[PDB]
């Protein structure tokens, strides 16, 4: 489903980790309750950083979305990640666009910008993104 | 019973034990083995590691996603003053290993190296080679028998050699003896050609050719003591625990009745010797020059010495080698750098490394600025 | 490339210093974390003597 080869970032939200949402689908925000692609090192939780997929649940929201497991996508984080091209960068906030696995999108935009890495990786966040 | 949460362990077993490595010196032990088409070279080299600093690198890996870009990666500068190739050993294949069969030095031996002998050099009337520099006196009839005898026998031929250290920052004195081996076609040729290098120096430049893995060998830095937690790296038990945390619980059990020799438990952390692996050089830098790290694309006279000298170390001011990434070691310390002993067909390693741009800035600090004569420009300029 | 400081004018070199985005999609490159985080404290560089942005506009050594 993922276009390409994620490079690592720095692991910012682990399990629980709310974040708001970025799309307008009315997921009001997200809850991480588990991550794709996560390794398994006993007691240790499953962190998702920015691109990662995860499995979200809306704690907040149109009902429609909410009391069921579905996959998003983390489009900002917080924690500051560093590109190898040598900078630091970190958002305001960490967030993410709800999403199928795929890789599509539920909500027709997305709010706020987006990291280049998780731009690169979906076709289709930087499609609904503006800034990246 | 049984574990429950099968989980991976802690530290790695054969690393033990973890001493305190009798030397300071990287003592390199394992050389490359053999090439009788390839000339007469030395394996290894002594260094002195200075401290690091980034560097701004092209990228050619195509595949990757960071294809043609600059891409900062850390590096280490390693001062390495010309070598002093002091003297001859030889080594005889036996069943109980190898042996030394002998050792020429040089007619004369610098005030460096000598002091190595000595622990109270100050006090030492300082006969460290005399009677030996007086086998030589006897036109050369000594020597050459020895010599002769190694070249007779002698599977292998370590040059001794020492580290100018009248050419760093150092407060040292005492340089730094090494064996390093030698590894071109035939022993009659090892032999002579370090009987034509005996006082004579060796430059990096010769050995090491930019762009190439350089297996760096060193004594870890140091901490001392260390409980568990931080040495082998345990989870620390929870805060409401009585007697304390950073602990490991439950050694063993029961039966076996003793103390596991794979449990992890405190004391020594550090100064270890560790060889570490596959560490490219990016650049091989000269002593009688101005802008060593000036580049193809930088064109600014600058010296590989950050502002204000390299944290610790001091300066530079003199030929080394821009390794890239960490070693194991401190600055100021003596970090033996070996060839790789197998070809990597690695393709990161092969990558014909061009370096864009270096940080020169202060290292003591957050620097701003490079140069100081970019400091000027930009402050103006003044007020002193 | 060399950038500049969004906080306090100076140059950052490549592989140093932060970069930042805030809510709006604006980017605030900092060279350390004195101008970093006077900008996450909310402070106005034109109220510190050490930026330049202070310093352009009392004229210093222009």
Same mark, same amino acid.
């Given at each position: 489903g993922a276009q390409g080869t994620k490079f690592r970032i720095s692991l910012?939200?682990?399990?629980?980790?709310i974040m708001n949402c970025?799309?307008?689908?009315?997921?009001r925000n997200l809850y991480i309750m588990a991550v794709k692609g996560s390794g398994s090192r006993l007691n240790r939780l499953p962190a998702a950083s920015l691109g990662d997929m995860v499995m979200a649940?809306? #704690?907040?929201? #149109?009902?429609?979305?909410?009391k069921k497991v579905m996959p998003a996508i983390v489009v900002?984080?917080?924690?500051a990640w560093r590109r190898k091209d040598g900078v630091f960068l970190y958002f305001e906030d960490n967030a993410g666009v709800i999403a199928n696995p795929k890789g599509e999108?539920?909500?027709?935009a997305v709010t706020g910008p987006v990291g280049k890495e998780c731009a690169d990786l979906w076709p289709r966040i930087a499609s609904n993104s503006g800034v990246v | 019973s049984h574990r429950k949460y099968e989980a991976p362990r802690h =530290? &790695?077993?054969?690393?033990?034990?973890?001493?305190?490595?009798?030397?300071?010196? =990287?003592?390199?032990?394992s050389f490359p083995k053999d090439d009788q088409t390839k000339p007469v070279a030395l394996t290894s080299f002594l260094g002195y590691k200075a401290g690091m600093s980034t560097i701004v690198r092209d990228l050619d890996?195509? =595949?990757?996603?960071? &294809?043609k870009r600059e891409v900062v990666e850390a590096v280490t500068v390693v001062d390495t003053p010309p070598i002093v190739v002091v003297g001859v050993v030889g080594y005889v294949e036996t069943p109980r290993g190898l042996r030394s069969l002998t050792t020429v030095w040089a007619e004369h031996l610098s005030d460096e190296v000598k002091?190595?002998?000595?622990?109270?050099w100050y006090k030492s009337?300082?006969? +460290?080679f005399t009677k030996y520099s007086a086998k /030589?006196?006897?036109?050369?009839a000594q020597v050459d028998r020895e010599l002769a005898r190694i070249k007779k026998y002698a599977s292998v031929v370590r040059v001794l050699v020492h580290t100018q250290?009248?050419?760093?920052?150092?407060? %040292?004195?005492?340089a730094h003896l090494a064996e390093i081996q030698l590894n071109g076609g035939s022993v009659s040729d090892k032999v002579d050609w370090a009987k034509e290098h005996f006082e004579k120096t060796v430059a990096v430049d010769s050995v090491f050719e930019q762009n190439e893995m350089i297996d760096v060998v060193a004594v870890t830095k140091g901490h001392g003591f260390e409980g568990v937690t931080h040495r082998w790296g345990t989870k620390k038990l929870p805060?409401?625990?009585?007697?304390?945390?950073?602990?490991?619980?439950?050694?063993? +059990?029961? &039966?076996?009745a003793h103390v596991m020799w794979s449990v992890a438990r405190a004391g020594q952390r550090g100064y270890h010797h560790r060889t570490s692996i596959?560490?490219?050089? /990016?650049r091989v830098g000269k002593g009688?020059?101005? +802008?060593?790290?000036?580049?193809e694309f930088d064109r600014?006279?600058?010296?590989?010495?950050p502002m204000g000298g390299f944290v610790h170390y001091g300066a530079i001011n003199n030929d080394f080698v821009i390794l890239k990434g960490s070693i194991p070691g401190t600055r100021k310390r003596v970090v033996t750098l070996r060839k790789s002993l197998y070809t990597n067909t690695s393709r990161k390693a092969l990558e014909e490394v061009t370096l864009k741009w270096i940080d020169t800035a202060?290292?003591? =600090?957050?620097?701003?600025? %490079?140069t100081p004569a970019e400091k000027h420009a930009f402050l103006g300029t003044l007020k002193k | 490339k060399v950038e500049i400081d969004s906080f306090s004018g100076a140059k950052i070199y490549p592989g140093r210093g932060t970069l930042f985005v805030r809510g709006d999609s604006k980017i605030f490159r900092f060279q350390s974390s004195k101008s970093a985080s006077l900008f996450h404290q909310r402070k106005?560089?034109?109220?510190?003597?050490?930026?330049v942005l202070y310093r352009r506009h009392h004229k210093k050594g222009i």
């Open positions: 910012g939200l682990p399990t629980g980790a970025a799309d307008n689908s009315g997921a649940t809306v #704690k907040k929201g #149109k009902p429609e979305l909410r900002r984080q917080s924690k999108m539920k909500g027709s | =530290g &790695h077993l054969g690393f033990l034990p973890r001493k305190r490595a009798a030397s300071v010196r =990287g003592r390199v032990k890996r195509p =595949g990757s996603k960071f &294809h002091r190595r002998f000595y622990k109270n009337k300082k006969k +460290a /030589y006196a006897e036109n050369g250290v009248r050419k760093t920052p150092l407060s %040292q004195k005492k805060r409401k625990t009585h007697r304390g945390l950073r602990k490991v619980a439950c050694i063993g +059990a029961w &039966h076996p596959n560490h490219k050089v /990016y009688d020059d101005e +802008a060593n790290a000036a580049t600014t006279k600058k010296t590989i010495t202060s290292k003591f =600090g957050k620097g701003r600025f %490079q | 106005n560089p034109r109220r510190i003597a050490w930026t």
